[PDB]
Design an enzyme around this catalytic site. Structure first.
Site, PDB file in Angstrom:
ATOM      1  N   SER A  79      43.808  34.339  41.718  1.00 13.08           N
ATOM      2  CA  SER A  79      44.033  34.335  43.443  1.00 13.08           C
ATOM      3  C   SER A  79      42.756  34.797  44.200  1.00 13.08           C
ATOM      4  CB  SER A  79      44.708  35.447  43.810  1.00 13.08           C
ATOM      5  OG  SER A  79      46.361  35.642  42.715  1.00 13.08           O
TER       6      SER A  79
ATOM      7  N   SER B  62      46.484  39.468  47.690  1.00 19.24           N
ATOM      8  CA  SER B  62      46.778  38.552  46.886  1.00 19.24           C
ATOM      9  C   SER B  62      47.958  37.184  47.011  1.00 19.24           C
ATOM     10  CB  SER B  62      46.768  38.288  45.219  1.00 19.24           C
ATOM     11  OG  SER B  62      46.127  37.757  44.775  1.00 19.24           O
TER      12      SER B  62
ATOM     13  N   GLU C 287      49.758  27.538  43.821  1.00 18.63           N
ATOM     14  CA  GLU C 287      49.946  27.736  43.265  1.00 18.63           C
ATOM     15  C   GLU C 287      51.324  28.041  42.888  1.00 18.63           C
ATOM     16  OE1 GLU C 287      47.903  33.146  43.948  1.00 18.63           O
ATOM     17  OE2 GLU C 287      48.442  31.490  42.444  1.00 18.63           O
TER      18      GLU C 287
ATOM     19  N   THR D 278      40.547  40.046  44.343  1.00 17.84           N
ATOM     20  CA  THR D 278      41.148  40.537  42.727  1.00 17.84           C
ATOM     21  C   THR D 278      41.530  38.989  42.495  1.00 17.84           C
ATOM     22  OG1 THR D 278      43.403  41.541  43.406  1.00 17.84           O
ATOM     23  CG2 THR D 278      41.278  43.130  42.387  1.00 17.84           C
ATOM     24  N   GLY D 279      41.553  38.999  40.897  1.00 12.55           N
ATOM     25  CA  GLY D 279      42.276  37.322  40.659  1.00 12.55           C
ATOM     26  C   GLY D 279      42.869  38.080  39.264  1.00 12.55           C
ATOM     27  N   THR D 280      44.672  37.794  38.991  1.00 10.37           N
ATOM     28  CA  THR D 280      45.205  37.389  37.355  1.00 10.37           C
ATOM     29  C   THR D 280      46.068  36.111  37.325  1.00 10.37           C
ATOM     30  OG1 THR D 280      45.428  39.968  38.441  1.00 10.37           O
ATOM     31  CG2 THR D 280      46.783  39.017  36.219  1.00 10.37           C
TER      32      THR D 280
END
Length: 269
Positions: free
Chosen positions: A43, A101, A141, A210-212
């Site tokens: 993200s 996100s 996504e 952030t990114g996950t």
């Protein structure tokens, strides 16, 4: 022993691969660890995505109502879900993309930027227009979180992505009034409490995205500021590939690398 070793131990212990990059400033030397390696965006693309949608449009365009459906929602969409029946503006989607996100919000922003079908190409072009000739988004996504390790699709490097953020927040790639909007959403970020914010003493100010994703993907990119206002840019990137597609992501790894960084950046020895 010395900072590359610290970072090597973090990997050994989390069973994870670690990418760190901090640019040099006047007084500081650059911190780099696998900084030229490809790491899944996840993200984190939403930050520069919003720069693109801002740079290529007047402030007036933030008030454009995008109507979408539950047909559209194919990813984690905290905010989008709530506004599916009244529709969201572009400002509201930019907000959702950064602060929660939001995957559906990033999907509609991709379409606004470069059309249905051309959205991700158009995103990677914005990067290209900022001298980033490495990063690439090849999918929306949720598929963009799901490429195996090795696959260059939907990746970037810490070197790359940090420099892109330096430009957006600390350089002139946006006019102040557009730049301030990006920063205010990154500064009001709800999802980054446990990563680079947690490696940095509370009198240092932090904005992040952030990114996950799969294979234990956890990413945080941030612009911090010393207590006297001296800015630095931090990208930390990780995957825990050994455990497969469903492997646990470790937010504690990113707090730990941010702590080494904070440790280098703050101590005046």
């Amino acid at each position: 022993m010395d900072l590359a070793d610290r970072f090597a131990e973090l990997e050994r212990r989390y069973d994870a691969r670690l990418g760190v990059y901090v640019p040099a400033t006047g007084t500081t030397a650059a911190i780099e660890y696998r900084a030229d390696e490809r790491f899944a965006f996840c993200s984190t693309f939403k930050a520069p995505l919003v720069a693109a949608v801002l740079h290529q449009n007047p402030l007036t365009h933030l008030d454009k109502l995008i109507t979408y459906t539950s047909d559209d929602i194919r990813s984690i969409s905290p905010v989008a879900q709530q506004h599916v029946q009244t529709g969201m503006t572009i400002g509201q989607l930019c907000d959702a993309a950064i602060r929660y996100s939001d995957g559906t919000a990033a999907n509609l922003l991709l379409a606004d930027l470069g059309g249905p079908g051309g959205g991700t190409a158009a995103f990677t072009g914005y990067l290209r227009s900022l001298g980033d000739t490495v990063s690439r988004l090849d999918a929306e996504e949720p598929e963009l979180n799901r490429d195996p390790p090795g696959d260059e699709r939907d990746t970037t490097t810490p070197h790359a992505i940090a420099l892109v953020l330096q430009q957006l927040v600390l350089g002139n790639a946006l006019p102040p009034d557009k730049r301030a909007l990006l920063t205010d959403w990154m500064a009001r970020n709800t999802t980054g409490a446990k990563r680079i914010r947690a490696g940095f003493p509370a009198d240092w100010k932090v904005i992040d995205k952030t990114g996950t994703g799969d294979y234990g993907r956890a990413n945080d990119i941030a612009v911090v500021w010393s207590p006297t206002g001296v800015p630095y840019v931090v990208a930390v990137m990780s995957d825990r590939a050994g455990g497969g597609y469903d492997a646990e992501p470790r937010e504690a790894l990113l707090a730990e690398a941010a702590t080494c960084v904070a440790g280098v950046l703050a101590l005046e020895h």
